Amino acid sequence: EEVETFAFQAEIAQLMSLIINTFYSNKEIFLRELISNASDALDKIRYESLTDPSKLDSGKELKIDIIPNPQERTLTLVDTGIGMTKADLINNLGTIAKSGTKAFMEALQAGADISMIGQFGVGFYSAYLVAEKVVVITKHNDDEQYAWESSAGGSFTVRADHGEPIGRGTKVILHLKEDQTEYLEERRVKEVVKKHSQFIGYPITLYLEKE
Ligand SMILES: Nc1nc2sc(CNC3CCN(C[C@@](O)(Cn4cncn4)c4ccc(F)cc4F)CC3)cc2n(-c2ccc3c(c2)N(c2ccccc2)CCO3)c1=O
Ligand SMILES: [Cl-]
Ligand SMILES: [Cl-]
């Protein structure tokens, strides 16, 4: 329905710019970071479901799917985790992300590298190592389905999403940069998952292209 546009916190915009502009070849770390976030979301619904089993009425299966689409030049990471509320998307996550962004930037000035971003809690933004645009479809039990989108440049949008219901969880859609299409290829995604995400406690299914 109505699209609302918001500015990132200045610190978050600055982090995104650093991610986009810094020469840094080891871009594959984005996948570990997004998988980690998906795992954390799954952990949360699992834990909440032990005191309120009805929280799984929106979907019992706790899983991560990684879906390449070469025709659309997208890599999608779908989880059936807890999902994000409207307040999470617009304000609350970025509020928390300020402190870790500051710590990370400081660590970079003192000699850390970009692969340490997850040690600071702000690994989502590493998506911009490979994506020109990120679309996030999300649904929490206590809210409606939303679509968040950002092509960086200091702004993001949020709108009620009337597309296909996802039930519960989050779908991170990476619109890949032209030179980052290796991350649509079978061997490559498998190699990266095996290297950095081997012990995640939820089934990770790596889909193949149909063509
Ligand atoms: N696949 C996912 N499923 C989920 S479902 C959910 C709610 N569930 C909560 C999530 C955070 N959990 C951890 C934590 O509270 C830890 N913490 C507390 N104090 C300091 N750190 C936290 C909060 C803010 C934050 F930036 C990182 C964090 F790790 C608590 C449960 C968040 C979430 N995320 C996620 C994780 C991360 C993020 C963002 C999103 N951000 C984002 C925002 C808008 C649009 C796109 C992405 C930006 C910052 O990063 C997923 O990708
Ligand atoms: Cl923000
Ligand atoms: Cl819930």
Curated annotation (Swiss-Prot):
Originating species: Homo sapiens
Annotated ATP binding sites: 37, 79, 98, 124
Protein name: Heat shock protein HSP 90-beta
Induction: By heat shock.
Modified residues (N6-succinyllysine): 210
Family that this chain belongs to: Belongs to the heat shock protein 90 family.
UniProt subcellular location: Cytoplasm; Melanosome; Nucleus; Secreted
Record remark: domains: The TPR repeat-binding motif mediates interaction with TPR repeat-containing proteins.
UniProt modification remark: Ubiquitinated in the presence of STUB1-UBE2D1 complex (in vitro).
Region of interest (Interaction with BIRC2), ranges: 1-205
Residue range from the parent sequence: 10 to 220 of 724
Phenotype when changing residue 33 to A: Strong ATP-binding. Strong interaction with HSF1, HIF1A, ERBB2, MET, KEAP1 and RHOBTB2
This protein's encoding gene: HSP90AB1
Function (record text): Molecular chaperone that promotes the maturation, structural maintenance and proper regulation of specific target proteins involved for instance in cell cycle control and signal transduction. Undergoes a functional cycle linked to its ATPase activity. This cycle probably induces conformational changes in the client proteins, thereby causing their activation. Interacts dynamically with various co-chaperones that modulate its substrate recognition, ATPase cycle and chaperone function.
Ranges where the record places region Interaction with NR3C1: 1-211
Site annotation Cleaved under oxidative stress: residues: 117-118
